[PDB]
């Protein structure tokens, strides 16, 4: 294709001894054989620049899990190929000109014994570095036992060992229980992807540093996360459009000194944003939050099991700045839990020194813009509603009502 042995076309690669295996029959087997060829040629720590695996547009079955254990592997297609399998699965499709996702289309047909399509893992040293996934489609094909479960035990990309400077861009993920998992992410960029109709979209697990999640379209399922970060420092979440129907849109546990700025959040359940287990010194600013109710009939009675006192934002931690956000709450009074409750927009569930400043709230019913738990200390609430919209169970909250 190019005059370099480090450029692979999955549609041109023949597996020695298995002449019937094609990218169409098992792209997993073809890419593992390509990686074996890389490891054969690149055999010292000063001769391992990696390679690019090109996936032309087409339909490819993946039966065999790909183990990515080399630095600077690029897996690159020519399109994210996103298609709403959720709408297809729930309407009359008579006369429809297309019935599945496309582009550089990998159908994830992994067994339960190796359920991640791409397992990015190296035992040993150093951190896996500079791996790129871009411009292709990972499709779990079906949920179990029906299209509305958001369950199938399949993962698109699982990075399971400490990693540096990974770049996930221009991807499409659809109908995976877990689209993308990255554990121990250092200097990760999840940028300009379509991650929708997955049980869970992006899970940043274990710990992380200096990460950017930007310019993504994401929608998850009601038992799953849209974006989750665990023990991240300096994660920046910006320019994302998060839409239903994750249990949450943004969930941090033990994340400190992170920034969630300039995003759009639309959810159908309480607890769209959760800062859990002592999140400290986070900036939650310049975001648009819309709490609505489900319009799509197959999900109308589906819930994340939380009531409207949980908060649109539910925060437990110290010295977070929740500022300069707009909250638009519109839930029919008969869909509010418990019956006759004032919904909570921002709940300070616990912690010291949290500051809520310049937030504009619109609701169709009487709401508490801010509730602060009895355990909250040295809280500040400025210009985020009339006195009558701010509930401090804590005796020491300083409150400036909107004039």
């Amino acid at each position: 294709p190019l005059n370099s042995p480090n450029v692979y076309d999955v549609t041109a690669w023949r597996i020695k001894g298995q002449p019937k295996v094609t990218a169409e029959s098992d792209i997993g087997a073809v890419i593992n054989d390509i990686i074996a060829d890389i490891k054969k040629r690149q055999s010292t720590p000063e001769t391992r620049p990696g390679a690019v695996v090109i996936i032309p547009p087409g339909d490819y079955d993946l039966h065999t899990q790909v183990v990515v254990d080399v630095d600077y592997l690029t897996i690159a297609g020519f399109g994210h190929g996103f298609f709403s399998r959720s709408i297809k699965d729930n309407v009359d499709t008579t006369g429809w000109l297309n019935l599945q996702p496309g582009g550089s289309h990998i159908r994830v047909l992994t067994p339960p014994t190796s359920p991640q399509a791409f397992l990015v893992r190296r035992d040993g040293s150093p951190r896996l570095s500079g791996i790129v996934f871009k411009d292709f489609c990972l499709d779990g094909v079906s949920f179990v036992p029906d299209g509305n479960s958001y369950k199938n035990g399949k993962t698109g990309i699982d990075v399971a060992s400490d990693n540096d400077s990974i770049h996930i861009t221009g991807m499409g993920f659809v109908y995976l229980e877990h689209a993308l998992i990255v554990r121990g992410a250092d200097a990760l960029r999840v940028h300009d992807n379509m991650v929708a109709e997955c049980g869970n979209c992006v899970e940043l697990t274990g710990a992380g540093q200096a990460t950017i999640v930007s310019d993504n379209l994401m929608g998850a399922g009601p038992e799953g996360v849209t974006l989750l970060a665990e023990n991240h420092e300096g994660l920046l979440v910006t320019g994302n459009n998060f839409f239903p129907r994750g249990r949450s849109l943004l969930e941090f546990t033990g994340c400190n000194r992170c920034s969630v700025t300039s995003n759009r959040f639309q959810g159908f359940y309480p607890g769209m944003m959760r800062l859990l287990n002592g999140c400290k010194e986070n900036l939650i600013t310049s975001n648009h939050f819309r709490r609505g109710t489900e319009g799509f009939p197959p999900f109308i009675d589906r819930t994340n099991g939380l009531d409207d006192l949980y908060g649109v934002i539910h925060a437990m931690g110290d010295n977070n700045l929740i500022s300069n956000n707009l909250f638009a709450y519109d839930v029919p009074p008969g869909k509010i839990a418990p019956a006759g409750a004032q919904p909570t927009i921002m709940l300070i569930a616990g912690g010291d020194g949290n500051v809520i400043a310049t937030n504009h709230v619109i609701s169709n019913v009487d709401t508490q813009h801010v509730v602060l738990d009895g355990s909250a200390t040295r809280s500040k609430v400025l210009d985020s509603g009339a006195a009558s919209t701010i509930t401090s169970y804590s005796p020491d909250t300083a409150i400036r009502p909107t004039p």
Copy 2:
């Protein structure tokens, strides 16, 4: 080029029955023939993954409108090829080493009755999904009757059918009356494009959902729009650099629960930002606004017909938050209209519950930072200027002057 029938090189493709037609002579005919080949091979609703059309760098004439009616079509070049035809058309080009745009360079030479270079449209179902335009140049070549009219009736890309997950990235648009139009956009991304010296840059028409317009350079002409959205819900506009000389830089009509955050706006006329016809619950925050005067001699006496009482931001609708913006106004007193008037920076033209908070204004003349129309109800103006810079003709506006 690759071992897939779904990868096309426009410079290698021969049209059966028209053997002398090349990408150089009519790339539109070549791409139409390629799309016919895709539809011949991809002949069932479960065998349509689409294809990539590759445009090497070069000068290509497009005479025949391309009709894109297949899902997951990627059209990709290797460069946006942007060149200022505006400077070229208006100065002495003696000894100039280049006189036109380049990269993957499509000269748009469409007939007046089929003027859009790319018409993206399908009659039937489902929505066209996952189409990608990237990394090429669409050039309208000339404006008529002269280079400064911003008129030629040509469009770069016109999406005229309901669409899902379209991605427009790394493009160059120049000297088109309309660069990009997208009707009924759902989960659209207009990302990291150069759209400049077009009459109109980006028109998001009809209605839309869950769209991101991010990281673009845009500049339009005095009778057209830079970014227009009509009846959008959850549109996120972030990281854009909007420069002159559109009639407006951002124009929303009937848009609700949208966000315009972390952009740079430079305009030479009033009405740089317009929220029109009852826009509700939009966040307008963390933007830099610069109102100046035309410095390029060919356009010095051009106007958009609006006076300085119209506003840098003109807002008509309910419950918008306009916060944490900087406005730098510098217009020679002789060019301010009406004669001797104080320019208006933010005009609330009408609507209920709008909040203006924490805005810094600089002006070379005495200005009203905020004017509220008499018809505005339950408005708040916080820390957006001294009492002498806020005019509320509405009697129920709550004003906290900057201390």
Copy 3:
């Protein structure tokens, strides 16, 4: 590879009469020969659409400086190939599977008399236009006399003449004294790059207009700048993750009407953000600032020579809005300079009309959240700390303490 003479593969291109000069031995010489071939074929101002130079993954030595003097040259690899040479140089690498960066990997081995790998420069008109550098790695290989000096006199990309619509995206820069310098930038985009372990990351010198620096990961060295801009107008800095250890993370000199919004800033020294020499009318909003101390043993005793009274933000100029930011200051008393001093978070060193509004500061010791020099005029401090945390030596500062 494709049926166009404007598509070059550096691994396929042979220099006629120099068969020993390959991409591997001197990719500089190869690309210079490709540019001579472009110039020979594209011989008139109406036949210069430019070309693409494709860099497959591999290890390539660059001994000869590349002179880019043609419009619409795209130089494109398949991977940024980033690897921490800094960690590699300072820890036990026994059993390490990789010891250097990779991807589309250019080892910069330039002579001291032509030290920039890529010099983008043209004498004559018009401005160089539409040049693209994407998806490859520029590696300076070593700092001298040891890995921790940040010194080698090498530059990755130096744009030395006036330019329009340049695009730098998906790049990796490592172990260069200067990664990227762009003089006289007009409509430049530095987007989604990895620029780390360089003495200086991005220097926007001379003057500039309408530029975007977005979605980058950047880390410099203690004598150098992360992002520098000189006399820029309408620069937008957004979505970036700036980490240590530059002298500063953002340094503006004489920049006016620019915007720094929705970024993450982590530094180990005072003066993380500097608005120097009369910066006017800039927006600094919705940013996360973290001032910490060096944790990586090899750099523990390194400093940028400034004391803790300099400021996390140091501003000298008029009418800047510094609002809606979070500052997390944690420096052990034994590392504060001078010993026993009260650190300053935001210093207004001078100028007229600066506004500081809605800033949340956390500090491990008592700090002055805001200090205004005696020379400051018409300053506003709103909701950026209790009265005991704001010090105005200027008599005309209006202060509203946080309630």
